[PDB]
Amino acid sequence: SVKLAGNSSLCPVSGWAIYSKDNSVRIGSKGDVFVIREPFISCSPLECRTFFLTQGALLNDKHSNGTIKDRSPYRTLMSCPIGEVPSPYNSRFESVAWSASACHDGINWLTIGISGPDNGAVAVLKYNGIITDTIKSWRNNVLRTQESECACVNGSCFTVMTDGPSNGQASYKIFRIEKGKIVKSVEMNAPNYYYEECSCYPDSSEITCVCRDNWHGSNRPWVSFNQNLEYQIGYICSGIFGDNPRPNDKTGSCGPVSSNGANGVKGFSFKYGNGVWIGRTKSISSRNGFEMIWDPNGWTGTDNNFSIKQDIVGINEWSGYSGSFVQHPELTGLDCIRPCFWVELIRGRPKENTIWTSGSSISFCGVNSDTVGWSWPDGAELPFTID
Amino acid sequence: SVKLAGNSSLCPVSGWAIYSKDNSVRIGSKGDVFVIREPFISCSPLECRTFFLTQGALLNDKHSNGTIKDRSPYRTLMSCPIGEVPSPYNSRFESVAWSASACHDGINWLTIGISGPDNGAVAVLKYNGIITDTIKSWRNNVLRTQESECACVNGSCFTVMTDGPSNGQASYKIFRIEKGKIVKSVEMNAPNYYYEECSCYPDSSEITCVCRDNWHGSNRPWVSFNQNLEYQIGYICSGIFGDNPRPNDKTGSCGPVSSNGANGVKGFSFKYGNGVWIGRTKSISSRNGFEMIWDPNGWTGTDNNFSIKQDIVGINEWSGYSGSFVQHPELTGLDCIRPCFWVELIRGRPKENTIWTSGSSISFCGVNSDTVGWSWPDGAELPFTID
Amino acid sequence: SVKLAGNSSLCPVSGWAIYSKDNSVRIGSKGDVFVIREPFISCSPLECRTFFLTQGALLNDKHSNGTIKDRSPYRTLMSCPIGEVPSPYNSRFESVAWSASACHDGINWLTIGISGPDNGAVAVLKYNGIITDTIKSWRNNVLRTQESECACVNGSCFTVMTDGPSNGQASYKIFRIEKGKIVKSVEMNAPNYYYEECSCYPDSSEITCVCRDNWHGSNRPWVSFNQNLEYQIGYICSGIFGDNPRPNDKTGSCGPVSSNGANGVKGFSFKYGNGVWIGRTKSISSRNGFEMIWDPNGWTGTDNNFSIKQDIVGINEWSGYSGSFVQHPELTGLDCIRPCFWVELIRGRPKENTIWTSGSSISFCGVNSDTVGWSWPDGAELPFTID
Amino acid sequence: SVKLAGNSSLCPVSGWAIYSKDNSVRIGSKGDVFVIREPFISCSPLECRTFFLTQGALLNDKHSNGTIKDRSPYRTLMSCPIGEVPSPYNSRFESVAWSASACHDGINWLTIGISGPDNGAVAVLKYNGIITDTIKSWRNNVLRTQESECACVNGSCFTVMTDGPSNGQASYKIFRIEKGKIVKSVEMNAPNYYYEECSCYPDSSEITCVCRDNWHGSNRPWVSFNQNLEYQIGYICSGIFGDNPRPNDKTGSCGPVSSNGANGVKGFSFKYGNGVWIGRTKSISSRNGFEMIWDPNGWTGTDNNFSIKQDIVGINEWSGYSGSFVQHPELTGLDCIRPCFWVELIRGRPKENTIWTSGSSISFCGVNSDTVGWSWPDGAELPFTID
Ligand SMILES: *[C@@H]1O[C@H](CO)[C@@H](O[C@@H]2O[C@H](CO)[C@@H](O[C@@H]3O[C@H](CO[C@H]4O[C@H](CO)[C@@H](O)[C@H](O)[C@@H]4O)[C@@H](O)[C@H](O[C@H]4O[C@H](CO)[C@@H](O)[C@H](O)[C@@H]4O)[C@@H]3O)[C@H](O)[C@H]2NC(C)=O)[C@H](O)[C@H]1NC(C)=O
Ligand SMILES: *[C@@H]1O[C@H](CO)[C@@H](O[C@H]2O[C@H](CO)[C@@H](O)[C@H](O)[C@H]2NC(C)=O)[C@H](O)[C@H]1NC(C)=O
Ligand SMILES: CCC(CC)O[C@@H]1C=C(C(=O)O)C[C@H](N)[C@H]1NC(C)=O
Ligand SMILES: CCC(CC)O[C@@H]1C=C(C(=O)O)C[C@H](N)[C@H]1NC(C)=O
Ligand SMILES: CCC(CC)O[C@@H]1C=C(C(=O)O)C[C@H](N)[C@H]1NC(C)=O
Ligand SMILES: CCC(CC)O[C@@H]1C=C(C(=O)O)C[C@H](N)[C@H]1NC(C)=O
Ligand SMILES: *[C@@H]1O[C@H](CO)[C@@H](O)[C@H](O)[C@H]1NC(C)=O
Ligand SMILES: *[C@@H]1O[C@H](CO)[C@@H](O)[C@H](O)[C@H]1NC(C)=O
Ligand SMILES: *[C@@H]1O[C@H](CO)[C@@H](O)[C@H](O)[C@H]1NC(C)=O
Ligand SMILES: *[C@@H]1O[C@H](CO)[C@@H](O)[C@H](O)[C@H]1NC(C)=O
Ligand SMILES: *[C@@H]1O[C@H](CO)[C@@H](O)[C@H](O)[C@H]1NC(C)=O
Ligand SMILES: *[C@@H]1O[C@H](CO)[C@@H](O)[C@H](O)[C@H]1NC(C)=O
Ligand SMILES: *[C@@H]1O[C@H](CO)[C@@H](O)[C@H](O)[C@H]1NC(C)=O
Ligand SMILES: *[C@@H]1O[C@H](CO)[C@@H](O)[C@H](O)[C@H]1NC(C)=O
Ligand SMILES: *[C@@H]1O[C@H](CO)[C@@H](O)[C@H](O)[C@H]1NC(C)=O
Ligand SMILES: [Ca+2]
Ligand SMILES: [Ca+2]
Ligand SMILES: [Ca+2]
Ligand SMILES: [Ca+2]
Ligand SMILES: [Ca+2]
Ligand SMILES: [Ca+2]
Ligand SMILES: [Ca+2]
Ligand SMILES: [Ca+2]
Ligand SMILES: [Ca+2]
Ligand code: NA
């Protein structure tokens, strides 16, 4: 058992091969499946797991009523093996949480679960399931974190948290965590930027995060930093705008794009020099479809020209959150950090006529062998009996 | 595999971080979850587990009827991982039981399960699941034990059992157990005191139990003892009365407080010199709400002043039993024994219009980092389909 | 990993302490629990498991119809941990079977599953889940075996099978099995005896079996043998008759007792010199109640006097099959082979008005510490929804 | 962990002993069991597993509707222990897949899952659950593979895939795979032959596959090859025709038998010099019944005489796909590779009045000890509540 090095570079990839699909909402029509949202995948050196925030309720049961609501004392962070439906009969309990992150350092799992009131929430940190630290709201306004895996390099794990309004300037902090203990934190000097729900990955011993600007950006903000949390900030320049909502593609910007910039969705991108692989919704106005786009100058260039598009979910199908996850050399035997991604397929409120909201997931891993575009949607037939 | 030392002091703590919530009643509306009461938590050097008394029945099925009744031949002690719902599909069988205790000495689990008739019940003790001893009622009036973890120091484990009436003087025995074999017991000389449902923990090689006076005490009795079962007795002196029911807070006593003293609820407290961390309901008359209070002179002083209160369950929400559990340094890597606690959130009879009674649970661990009060209640909407 | 020696003697016991209870029929009212009959318990050096023959159907579902029927191609031998309900979500598959045995030699499990036609059934033998032998019907008339654990001594396991009519002379064979291969078999010369559903245990390197005489005996037949299968035969002499049905107690006999001798129930007894611990039903006419009786001269003496009676199930409660199981020193750390027993609590047809028949279980281990009689019945309220 | 040698010969067998039956459809009347088809069994050096293609839906739920359809984005390759029902609570996720194969090389599991569109499907290969390679359709017409285990010899695993029309000449490729990487493939020169759904097994370091001619053969095509993918081709010569549909038995041919040759069913056979063990349906026109036949000159001789027949499923009962699996010496301790087989028992559409199609399974292993013919059918009573 050894710490993940995290010192190799990301594997360059040409396409995305399908890795998992859980069908949770379809199975939940009869089976005992948690109502969940905000799922994500994270791997150890031995396995990949899906983490998710339950609503303390099963699908097709009356307790799923009102699960559009984001924060309650019932919500818990749990995990199961990748591609299995999240059930009380296969799910490991992690934390009481309405916002979370998790990652494995090579030795044990770090989990971060935030609960408590909007005016004073507390992140509880656990290492191997023992509480090892806490951090409390410093702006008293919905302390919130990634909803995806943290990133680890040589025994240190890193995450981003946000505290403040969701329609204006907020405060953003970056953390270094070792064996579940916060050993350093810094508050970002980022005037006119906004960051939340960051998707962060390791790459050549450094951390890159691509986040959501809910304030006034239709492109995605990024922050990268080293083990000492010395950081750099920007927005993805590509005119292939990554957020949802967003305008139609056109010339981009290296700061925040204000057009359709308010609101957003969690997402990700991978940086390869001046190029970028963007995952995004296919619809500009709602969480519908999903596609991956390789723009070989999109990190720093502002044109809307790109070279590869691979379909993942069809434009008439419900999508949702998406996030990065990696497979390290210690897991794969490769000489590089493999990029993967998951997509959350949201069903129910607000877009459908149900009492509940819940998601399934799909996930894909980067390869340089042949791949194909298609649509792998949630597949459930709504409404359900309970509705 | 090594014996827990049990020789360090209790970790000093400033507040309580949420550790687990299982949502059992919410989930059992649809899923297959045991009807249970008398849950508790106990840890080995490798994991923590929820122990509970089943009713041999599942939520929202007809055999849930009558489960207000405490003692039957159908009740079984079973256990599942912390924060998971207790289900037939995830629960390990421990013992046939309508009163129980369990604790891990560092090598194997000890379990104590009392079944049989009210006039001659028998505790069956198991070590690693094998029957290693029995002990029979010696007063023929409902032999009963902790309903929370026993406590272990250097390969010996300790518990308390009571036999006799619940509305007057009863008999109270302390036991030293090694590899599931009773090696010593003493009957306590405790005239005008009453002990049941003790929450016992180790602290610097000695055991301290805080219990329930069902006879005539609205404050809690305590007994502390060494590995030779040489014991000291007393009641918590604080005017912050710990039992339910109780009077409003006023000047306390170091003997039993007779005002509102009859009846009770299982609870716990932690001694820190002359100070005390008290867990109690928020209502003085029913099992509603829960709070943690630090009273720096409350173990020995009778005033009703305290220095810290942390809300756990709101006053208008159902609560129930509570107990202590510890995390030893062999589990955590700390230099001290960490105090934690669980609360049972009882739903159904006698307070609600159901045919059944069952609980869910929440637990917290003591920390010195930032924490917050809130309410994490059961959350189920009663009555259910079967009612 | 080492072979069970099997060379110590049975632990003398003074009473029976309750070990497990599954509540399967109560739980199966809503949960996903197999319809089963013919359960039994068997232990390895690490754990005890319950084996059972499913009917390829779940309780309270339409496929449980007609499960009074003994033999079908749907019936399977499965196992789960002791005291858990048998569900498809916790159950290990063993063999396709309508009659069975299993036992662990210290290294691996042996399972014996008989299926196929009444006129040519085949026992399939498996070691560690691999098929290692078969034995086919030699009288073409329902080849059948113990429905309880086989017995192992020094790497050899032993069982008994029967082939022929159930209302007359049949044929009875004894088998020695090593690593799942039949290494010797003998046909018993036992004119005027009848043996089936033998409960067999090791004791001082030899096997004792106590069986069912369905032809013309209301006491139980026995056969004991060494590793070479050189055997002796007799019937339990005590006037405390062990079978069901049977007459009221009176002077017994050392050969078959013809009064109420046709028909029967699987059962067991333990021999301790000239004395016997007898488990039997409390009713003389039907499968109701259960009790254990220590008769200090009952193996070889014919009087109906006895020393100890311990109630297990009350006379107005349903019982059923019962069988021996042992815990070897390699499991317990004792210097003797510990005797235990289980009882099948049968519900449904033919005594109740249901479409199905299915059983739960209770089990007890022998101890020399204090015990108590009680009733631990099945507890389900019939009929069920499906009826 | 050591690589399976795969260099010994097939064990000679006189008959087939029943190994497993899962009763999936019967159990899924109430419990949470996947709608599935295309099951198959494959073994590591430590256990045997059932692999199957789910429909992303449970039996007796509305999302089972339309499951006659073969290919969708919801289908997933998943696995559970042999003989257990495939449930979301006991099944391991393998791959997104509407056509599949898997096999264990002695060190790790290889899985092959084809998803994507009919005009450009992609097989995703995983080794130990990590994506190790992909291969894309090369004729753009439903890339498809074995629906049974691939075959392994000294660290290399072999499979066959087909691409093109199912009512005419298509293209057939053989693959050598090492640690989940395709290291060699060849396209077969096979004019006038047709191969799909190959059942492949190792025998003396070489692979023999018996497949389905959906174009114009009522006998089965075979291809055998060495580790270099040097291959020989042929059809089974026996006038005991192996496909469904087929003619009644008459003189066979060593080329495709065109009488009733169109359409087909996945099946298997085992070669023993000039002889052959044939598994087939009992009906000549529909997937009903199953029997095993030993024809001592049937691999190369065209007569319709055989030496042994062993009933498996009766003629009036539903059957389906069948395939081979092996137990290598590293698992059994034998000196030869043991042949086994499974049969899928298909229920629902198109033959029955349901909204859904699903299968259960049975399997058998080859022995030289005594065996018996019988019928072990699915057993479920259709239609179901949902229909
Ligand atoms: C939760 O649990 C409670 C407590 O048990 C249930 O309340 C019981 O409900 C049952 C069923 O309704 C009651 O049992 C019934 O009693 C009837 C009347 O019994 C008395 O009066 C008759 C004369 O009419 C006398 O013959 C008899 O000796 C009694 O003095 C009976 O008529 C019913 O009998 C029928 O069913 C039985 C099954 O054994 C048949 O054998 C009979 O022939 C007959 O067909 C029946 O026994 C019982 O009294 C209630 N108990 C209490 C304490 O009130 C709740 O119903 C339950 N709730 C839910 C939701 O399940
Ligand atoms: C339920 O089982 C009954 C019997 O209890 C079924 O009736 C027939 O099939 C059985 C085969 O197992 C036999 O046991 C019966 O003797 C036989 N004939 C009868 C009762 O006349 C009956 O068809 C089944 N019920 C349902 C709902 O299908
Ligand atoms: C709290 C503001 C933030 C951005 C608007 O809300 C997020 C939006 C969500 C969304 O856009 O779907 C779902 C997240 N669960 C929620 N996070 C929390 C902590 O409640
Ligand atoms: C036996 C008397 C005792 C104190 C009143 O009853 C306890 C009270 C209970 C309670 O106050 O909720 C529930 C406990 N399950 C019960 N213990 C037993 C062994 O039945
Ligand atoms: C086969 C005759 C035998 C004795 C009457 O029947 C047994 C009786 C039974 C019984 O008396 O309850 C149940 C057993 N499952 C059955 N065994 C078999 C193989 O069917
Ligand atoms: C694609 C052609 C092929 C042969 C007709 O269809 C198969 C026939 C099937 C059948 O005959 O039952 C079911 C298989 N699931 C299907 N394979 C695929 C990949 O869909
Ligand atoms: C990465 O870290 C490993 C393990 O410590 C080290 O041996 C190696 O020199 C470093 N870099 C690369 C790119 O392999
Ligand atoms: C959902 O909650 C609303 C408002 O509290 C209520 O009207 C409705 O009955 C609920 N539906 C269900 C199925 O519980
Ligand atoms: C990794 O961390 C360890 C322990 O802090 C340290 O010894 C080592 O130098 C670090 N390696 C790098 C490349 O930073
Ligand atoms: C506690 O016990 C340990 C382990 O036996 C021993 O080595 C140590 O000296 C003791 N520590 C304290 C704080 O008393
Ligand atoms: C712990 O127990 C062992 C065995 O009884 C004993 O030798 C040792 O002295 C004990 N340690 C203490 C500190 O009591
Ligand atoms: C039992 O067998 C053990 C282990 O082989 C042996 O050491 C011992 O002598 C035997 N005991 C008796 C009483 O025969
Ligand atoms: C037990 O079996 C082994 C191996 O056959 C043999 O060597 C040994 O003598 C046997 N022991 C006894 C006590 O018979
Ligand atoms: C097969 O291979 C094994 C292991 O490599 C070797 O030892 C043996 O000689 C070979 N066996 C046969 C039957 O050829
Ligand atoms: C099944 O699917 C068909 C086609 O969409 C539809 O017409 C039918 O109503 C569905 N039936 C059920 C019972 O859901
Ligand atoms: Ca935005
Ligand atoms: Ca560009
Ligand atoms: Ca009191
Ligand atoms: Ca005070
Ligand atoms: Ca008899
Ligand atoms: Ca006597
Ligand atoms: Ca259910
Ligand atoms: Ca054909
Ligand atoms: Ca021939
Ligand atoms: Na009956």
CA distances from C197 to C6, C10, C122, C140, C163 (A): 22, 21, 17, 18, 12
Rounded to 5 degrees, φ, ψ at D197 are 55, 45
And the tokens for B95? 């013992």
Contact list in B for residue C81 (CB cut-off 8 A) is 92-93
b/e D121-152 (16+ beta carbons within 10 angstroms → b): bbbbbbbbbbbbbbbbbbeebbbbbbbbbbbb
Which residues of chain C approach chain D closer than 8 Å at the C-beta?
32, 54, 56-58, 60-63, 72-74, 76, 78, 87-89, 91-96, 115-117, 120-122, 124, 129-131, 133-136
Cβ neighbors of C182 (< 8 A, separation 6 or more) are: C125, C133, C135, C175, C176
CA distances from A98 to A103, A115, A194, D351 (A): 17, 6, 21, 49
In total, chain B counts a number of residues equal to 387
In C121-169, beta strands by DSSP E: 122-127, 130-136, 151-153, 156-163
And the tokens for D343? 């049969």
Query: Minimal CA–CA distance to C78: which of C100, C107, C45?
Result: C100
Going by the DSSP 8-state scheme, the letter that residue D9 receives in this structure is P
In total, chain D counts a number of residues equal to 387
Find out whether A71 is annotated in a ligand binding site.
Answer: yes
Distance in Å, alpha carbon of D173 to nearest chain C alpha carbon? 34
Query: Minimal CA–CA distance to A81: which of A161, A20, A11?
Result: A20
Q: Do B90 and A88 touch (CB under 8 A)?
A: yes
Spatial contact of C224 and C208, defined as CB atoms under 8 Å apart: yes
Spatial contact of C312 and C292, defined as CB atoms under 8 Å apart: yes
State the Cα–Cα distance between residues A209 and A201, nearest whole angstrom: 7
Cβ neighbors of B168 (< 8 A, separation 6 or more) are: B215
Residue of A61, A76, A91 with shortest CB distance to B30: A61
Q: Do A90 and D89 touch (CB under 8 A)?
A: yes
And the tokens for B340? 């934690």
Is residue A185 in contact with ligand 8, taking CB distance under 6 Å?
no
Is residue D315 in contact with ligand 14, taking CB distance under 6 Å?
no
State the Cα–Cα distance between residues A16 and A311, nearest whole angstrom: 10
Helix (H/G/I), strand (E/B), else coil: A309: strand
Write out the H or E segment, with its range, that includes residue B25: helix B24-28
Cβ neighbors of D22 (< 8 A, separation 6 or more) are: C93, D50, D83, D84, D85, D86, D360, D361
Going by the DSSP 8-state scheme, the letter that residue D64 receives in this structure is G
Amino acid identity of residue D203, one-letter, is D
In sequence order, what DSSP letters do the residues of B261-322 get, joined into one string?
-SS-----EEEETTEEEEEE-SSSSSSEEEEEEEETTTTT------SEEEEEEEEEEE---E
Distance in Å, alpha carbon of B182 to nearest chain C alpha carbon? 11
b/e C298-327 (16+ beta carbons within 10 angstroms → b): bbebbbbebeeebbbbbeebbbbbbbbbbb
Q: Which atom of ligand 1 is nearest to the CA of B66?
A: 2
And the tokens for B322? 């509570």
And the tokens for C188? 């018993």
Is residue B211 in contact with ligand 4, taking CB distance under 6 Å?
no
Interface residue of A20, A26, A312 to substitute, partner D, most D CBs within 10 Å:
A26
Residue of C27, C365, C372 with shortest CB distance to B122: C372
Spatial contact of A343 and A168, defined as CB atoms under 8 Å apart: no
Q: Do D32 and A32 touch (CB under 8 A)?
A: yes
Spatial contact of B27 and A58, defined as CB atoms under 8 Å apart: yes
State the Cα–Cα distance between residues B310 and B289, nearest whole angstrom: 12
State the Cα–Cα distance between residues B7 and C282, nearest whole angstrom: 53
Which residues of chain C approach chain B closer than 8 Å at the C-beta?
17-23, 26-27, 29-33, 47-48, 81-85, 87, 89-90, 327, 331-332, 362, 365, 367, 369-372, 374-377, 379-381
Is residue B7 in contact with ligand 10, taking CB distance under 6 Å?
yes
Query: Minimal CA–CA distance to C180: which of C129, C230, C114, C231?
Result: C129
Q: Which chain D residue lies closest to C65 (C-alpha atoms)?
A: D381
Strands D181-187 and D171-178: antiparallel
Write out the H or E segment, with its range, that includes residue C358: strand C357-367
Q: Which chain D residue lies closest to A331 (C-alpha atoms)?
A: D130
Spatial contact of A362 and A18, defined as CB atoms under 8 Å apart: yes
The structure was resolved experimentally with X-ray
Residue A386 alpha carbon to ligand 8 centre in Å: 10
Backbone CA torsion sign across A16, A18, A24, A29: positive
Catalytic site positions of D: 70, 321
Rounded to 5 degrees, φ, ψ at D27 are -70, -35
Query: Minimal CA–CA distance to A343: which of A22, A100, A109, A68?
Result: A22
No. of H helices and E strands in chain C? 2, 24
Find out whether B243 is annotated in a ligand binding site.
Answer: yes
Helix (H/G/I), strand (E/B), else coil: B117: coil
Look-up of token digits 């106590």: C210
State the Cα–Cα distance between residues A135 and A128, nearest whole angstrom: 18
Is residue B99 in contact with ligand 4, taking CB distance under 6 Å?
yes
Backbone CA torsion sign across B179, B180, B182, B187: positive
Residue of C54, C92, C120 with shortest CB distance to D372: C120
Look-up of token digits 């399967």: C24
Cα D264 to chain centroid distance, Å, stands at 13
Find out whether C387 is annotated in a ligand binding site.
Answer: no
Is residue D214 in contact with ligand 6, taking CB distance under 6 Å?
yes
Is residue D367 in contact with ligand 14, taking CB distance under 6 Å?
no
Q: Exactly one of B32, B61, B70, B311 is catalytic; name it.
A: B70
Q: Which atom of ligand 3 is nearest to the CA of A346?
A: 12
State the Cα–Cα distance between residues A276 and A267, nearest whole angstrom: 13
Look-up of token digits 């439903």: D142
State the Cα–Cα distance between residues B109 and C221, nearest whole angstrom: 41
Contact list in A for residue B375 (CB cut-off 8 A) is 73
Residue C31 alpha carbon to ligand 14 centre in Å: 51
And the tokens for C146? 């113990």
Contact list in D for residue A380 (CB cut-off 8 A) is 63
State the Cα–Cα distance between residues C88 and D86, nearest whole angstrom: 9
Catalytic site positions of A: 70, 321
Q: Which chain A residue lies closest to D90 (C-alpha atoms)?
A: A90
- The four Cα atoms D127, D99, D262, D350 give a dihedral, to 10 degrees, of 140
In sequence order, what DSSP letters do the residues of B258-272 get, joined into one string?
-TT-SS-----EEEE
Amino acid identity of residue D224, one-letter, is S
Is residue D386 in contact with ligand 14, taking CB distance under 6 Å?
no
State the Cα–Cα distance between residues A59 and D32, nearest whole angstrom: 14
Provide the β-strand partners of residue B365.
B17, B340
Interface residue of C32, C290, C369 to substitute, partner B, most B CBs within 10 Å:
C369
Q: Which atom of ligand 9 is nearest to the CA of A156?
A: 2
Find out whether A38 is annotated in a ligand binding site.
Answer: no
Provide the β-strand partners of residue B220.
none
Interface residue of B13, B16, B21, B58 to substitute, partner A, most A CBs within 10 Å:
B21
Residue D351 alpha carbon to ligand 21 centre in Å: 66
Is residue B142 in contact with ligand 4, taking CB distance under 6 Å?
yes
CA distances from A242 to A280, A285, A319 (A): 5, 12, 14
Rounded to 5 degrees, φ, ψ at B275 are -95, 170
Cβ neighbors of D156 (< 8 A, separation 6 or more) are: D105, D176, D177, D178, D183, D227
In sequence order, what DSSP letters do the residues of C164-202 get, joined into one string?
S-SSS--EEEEEEEETTEEEEEEE---TT----S-EEEE
Provide the β-strand partners of residue C50.
C41, C80
Spatial contact of D76 and D109, defined as CB atoms under 8 Å apart: no
Q: Do A134 and B27 touch (CB under 8 A)?
A: no
Q: Do C135 and D31 touch (CB under 8 A)?
A: no
Contact list in C for residue B58 (CB cut-off 8 A) is 27, 29-31
**Cis ω before A383 (30° cut-off from 0):** yes
Residue A92 alpha carbon to ligand 3 centre in Å: 24
State the Cα–Cα distance between residues A310 and A291, nearest whole angstrom: 6
No. of H helices and E strands in chain D? 2, 24
Spatial contact of B56 and C27, defined as CB atoms under 8 Å apart: yes
Amino acid identity of residue A311, one-letter, is D
Query: What's the topology of domain C1-387?
Result: Neuraminidase (2.120.10)
Q: Which atom of ligand 15 is nearest to the CA of D386?
A: 13
Q: Do A29 and D62 touch (CB under 8 A)?
A: yes
